[PDB]
Amino acid sequence: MGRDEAGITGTWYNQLGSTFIVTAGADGALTGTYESAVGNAESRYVLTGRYDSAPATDGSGTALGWTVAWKNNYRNAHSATTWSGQYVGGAQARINTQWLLTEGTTEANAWASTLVGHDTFTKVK
Amino acid sequence: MGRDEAGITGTWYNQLGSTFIVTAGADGALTGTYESAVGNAESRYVLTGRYDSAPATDGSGTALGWTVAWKNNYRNAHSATTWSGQYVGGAQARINTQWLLTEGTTEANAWASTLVGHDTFTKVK
Amino acid sequence: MGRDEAGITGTWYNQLGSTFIVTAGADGALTGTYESAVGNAESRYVLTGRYDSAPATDGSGTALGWTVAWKNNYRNAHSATTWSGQYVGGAQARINTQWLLTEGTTEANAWASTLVGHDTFTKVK
Amino acid sequence: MGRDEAGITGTWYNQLGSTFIVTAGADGALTGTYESAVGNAESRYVLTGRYDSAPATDGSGTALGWTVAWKNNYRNAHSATTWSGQYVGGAQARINTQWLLTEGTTEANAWASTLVGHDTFTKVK
């Protein structure tokens, strides 16, 4: 059982009103679904990622990351987002992330392929 | 069969001499192993990610991303990297990425939790 | 007179308790001083940057950016931070930024040269 | 006289064919003009920034950064780019950077305000 397997598993919400549904495996796996409240997206998309299943015991957060490719049965935005961040446990548990959103482009437009931003996920809202 | 399933599957190398071994699934899954030539890393680490299995047919690249958590049987760097980028097929196939490397930190040090960089992967070297 | 010259000029504070003192010029210049509450920093450092002196009139924010090199009479952290973001005017005025912090490194360590993060500045606190 | 004042001052070119014309001051200032070969840009734009005028003497690079707001007499792209990076001196001198490009947006679109990328500048091409 990963140190924060129970803390990470469940339904999370970010500041945009997106919904992150994840299961943390004992082995370090993250699996689930993502629903974006914004952008060229509708309904759920598959996500997969990894987390540190044996984090530091000095009060540090737990490093994790995941990917969504923005293709499902409804839409294809020809793009993928990766979130990189840390889980911080406790009464007001949080996942604090930064993300990179890449779209497929021509070589001439590849300089403009990637958005960067930050999302904070909580168990409420 | 994903449009670039065959193009993406295989062994890739970046400019640091790291080795990315990946299998692309028909469903959009990426699975495999990563070996970093640099940093607090030794041997292989599990990776998982996603790719656009039906990309644009206008000469755009194929969006993809993946995650490594830097824990294996040898070491634990209490960190995770996510790569976000695009696959560009052809004689000199490439995966062009940007990445985010987050370490677990205390809340006081969380401003300094995340490195950013860029890796280019080719099928040779 | 830049559209938001008066709105941007003044003393700003971020979520870390750092202090950003800036003058916006009619020509698009930003000049002032930065004092970091965290990291290898003490007292004030010179800053310079630019802003859009004729922003869109459709309720969009005002794009701006600035640089600090972390050398002053007290310390030299051999690093520079750049903030890129937008000014949003009104009762609860804000500057919403993302930043890149580069340290001088050897070529072997250059993959690890750059931190990324996000700061929100307000006129209170 | 800054350690790399003479090395940094001059005309630089990146991989897109953009032109960076800069003067490094003894005090740590960068001033000059930028001409982008791509995007919503024409002719020269003002730039300002900072560099470490007393870098480490252990073979590390020299940290620097600069800003362009994409307004000139010809066009206004309501955006600003900041480059953060390091200068590496020698026969094949380089400035290795990462950048953040923010556009002014509405609050509803602010998640999508910022591009990230990387530019390498050389004294030839």
How far apart (Å, rounded) are the C-alpha atoms in residues D43 and D7?
25
- State whether residue D11 is helix, strand or coil: strand
Please list, in sequence order, all residues whose beta carbon lies within 8 angstroms of the beta carbon of residue A90, skipping any fewer than 6 positions away: none
Measured CA to CA, the distance from residue C45 to residue D65 in angstroms comes to 14
Write a three-state SS string for chain B. CCCCHHHHCEEEEECCCCEEEEEECCCCEEEEEEECCCCCCCCCEEEEEEECCCCCCCCCCEEEEEEEEEECCCCEEEEEEEEEEEEECCCCCEEEEEEEEEECCCCCCHHHCEEEEEEEEECCC
A100 → chain C, closest CA residue: C116
Q: Which residues of D touch B117 (CB under 8 A)?
A: 98
Say which DSSP state C6 is in: H
Give me D116's structure tokens.
Answer: 């990230």
Residue D65's identity, in one-letter code, is G
Task: Identify which of C49, C95, C31, C102 has the alpha carbon closest to the alpha carbon of residue D113.
Answer: C95
Contact at CB, A116 and C117, closer than 8 angstroms: no
From CA B69, how far away is CA B113, in angstroms rounded?
Answer: 15
The C-alpha of B55 sits at a distance from chain A's nearest C-alpha, in angstroms, of 6
Note the residue count of chain A.
125
- Length of chain D counted residue by residue: 125
| Structure tokens given for A107 | 């070589």
Interchain pair B50, A52: CB under 8 A:
no
β-sheet bridge partners, residue B77:
none
CB-based contacts of D84, cutoff 8 Å, min separation 6: C67, C80, C81, C82, C99, C100, C101, C102, C114, D64, D65, D97, D98, D99, D100
Q: What are phi and psi of A11, to 5 degrees?
A: -105, 130
How far, in Å, CA of B79 to CA of D42, rounded?
A: 42
> What are the chain C neighbours of D69 within 8 Å (beta carbons)?
28, 50-53, 63-65
Contact between B47 and A51 (Cβ < 8 Å): no
Cα B108–B111–B116 angle (5° rounding)? 145
**What domains can be seen in chain B, in order of their start residue?**
1-125 (2.40.128.30)
φ and ψ of C111, to 5 deg? -55, -30
Spatial distance between the Cα atoms of D116 and C65, rounded to a whole number of angstroms: 14
Nearest-Cα residue of chain A relative to residue B51: A69
Rounded to whole angstroms, the Cα distance separating B80 from A96 reads 13
Output the six-digit token pair for B103: 């370490």
Contact list in D for residue C70 (CB cut-off 8 A) is 52, 63
Q: Which residues contact D115 (CB under 8 A, 6 or more apart)?
A: A112, A114, A115, A116, D100, D101
Q: From the CB of residue D11, how many other CB atoms can be counted at a distance below 10 Å? A: 12
CA distance D88 to D3: 12
State the structure-solving technique.
X-ray
Tokens of B1: 């069969």
Distances (CA, A) of D124 to D4, D18, D33, D91, D121: 18, 12, 17, 11, 9
The gap between the terminal CA atoms of chain B, to the nearest Å, is 28
Is B104 in contact with A60 (CB distance < 8 Å)? yes
**B116–chain D Cβ distance below 8 A for any pair:** yes
- DSSP class of residue D37 equals S
What are the b/e assignments for C87-112, b being 16+ CB within 10 Å? Answer: bbeeeebbbbbbbbbbbbbeeeebbe
**Separation of alpha carbons C81 and C70, rounded Å:** 8
- Which of A52, A56, A107 has its CB closest to that of B88? A107
A20, A44, B7, C23, D118 from B64: Cα distances, Å: 19, 17, 13, 42, 19
Binding site membership of B: which residues? 34, 45, 83, 99, 111
Asked if residue B53 lies in contact with residue B89, where contact means CB atoms within 8 angstroms, the answer is no
Q: Outline where DSSP puts E strands in chain A.
A: 10-14, 19-24, 29-35, 45-51, 62-71, 76-88, 94-103, 114-122
Task: Kindly state the DSSP code that residue C53 receives in the 8-state scheme.
Answer: S
Distance CA C81, CA D88 (A): 18
Query: Nominal resolution in Å?
Result: 1.5
Q: From CA D112, how far away is CA D118, in angstroms rounded?
A: 18
- Reduced to 3 states (helix: H, G, I; strand: E, B; else coil), residue C12 is strand
**B88-to-A69, A104, B99 alpha-carbon distances in Å:** 16, 9, 17
Q: Give the ranges where chain C is alpha helix by DSSP (H).
A: 5-8
Q: How many CA atoms lie within 13 A of A82 on its CB side?
A: 33
Contact B122, B92 (CB under 8 A): yes
D107 touches chain A (CB under 8 A): no
Sign of CA dihedral C63, C69, C70, C73: negative
Rg (CA), chain C: 15
- List of residues 6+ apart from B10 with CB closer than 8 A: B21, B22, B123
Contact of A106 with chain D, judged by CB distance below 8 Å, is answered with: no
Read off the tokens for B70: 């830097």
Work out the widest C-alpha separation in chain D, in whole angstroms.
Answer: 48
Half-sphere exposure of A76 (CA within 13 A, CB side): 14
The b-or-e profile of B59-87 (16+ CB within 10 A means b, else e) is ebbbbbbbbbbbbbeeebbbbbbbbbbbb
Is the backbone of residue B58 left (phi > 0), alpha (psi -120 to 50) or beta? alpha
Contacts 24+ apart (CB under 8 A), B89-97: B89/B4, B89/B7, B89/B62, B92/B122, B93/B7, B93/B122, B93/B123, B94/B120, B94/B121, B94/B122, B95/B8, B95/B12, B95/B20, B95/B64, B95/B120, B95/B121, B96/A110, B96/A113, B96/B61, B96/B120, B97/A102, B97/B121
In one letter, which amino acid is D7?
Answer: G
C-beta atoms surrounding A56 within 10 Å: 17
User: Residue A11 and residue A31: Cα distance in Å, rounded?
Assistant: 12
Cα separations in angstroms, B74 against A57, A105, B28, B40, C9: 18, 39, 30, 11, 53
Phi, psi dihedral angles at D7 (to 5 degrees): -70, -40
Helix H or strand E segment including D31: strand D29-35
Spatial separation of the C-alpha atoms in residues A71 and B63, rounded to whole Å = 10
